[PDB]
Amino acid sequence: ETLYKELGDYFVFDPKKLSVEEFFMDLHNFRNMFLQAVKENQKRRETEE
Amino acid sequence: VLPFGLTPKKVYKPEVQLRRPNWSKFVAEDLSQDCFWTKVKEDRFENNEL
Fold this sequence. Notes:
This is part of a larger assembly, with two copies of chain A. The longest helix of chain A has 29 residues, at 20-48. The first copy, chain A, has helices at residues 2-10, 20-48. The first copy, chain A, is rod-shaped. The first copy, chain A, is mainly alpha-helical. Chains A and B meet through loops of A and loops of B. The PDB classes it as cytosolic protein. Keywords: Actin, Elongation, Ends, cytosolic protein. The entry is titled "mDia1 in the middle of F-actin". Chains A, B are Protein diaphanous homolog 1. Organism of A, B: Mus musculus.
């Protein structure tokens, strides 16, 4: 509880009303979408070449 | 006078209205003293070609 409260001071993210698994999932889904967008830009540059 | 010594942001005037993302913005009252958003130095990424 103390280390999660130490996480609540570095990033604020409304610590009274925030679950933990929803915050990690949106970081994970943005990580998978950004890696998909880099490979789609490489595939678009391969098609344009 | 914004809290935590923050300057007001650069108000841009585009000639063409662009498609915009619509988020829930955090004002300087919403930010804390030791957060990430008070140390933002985004003007080093500024470019007219961008």
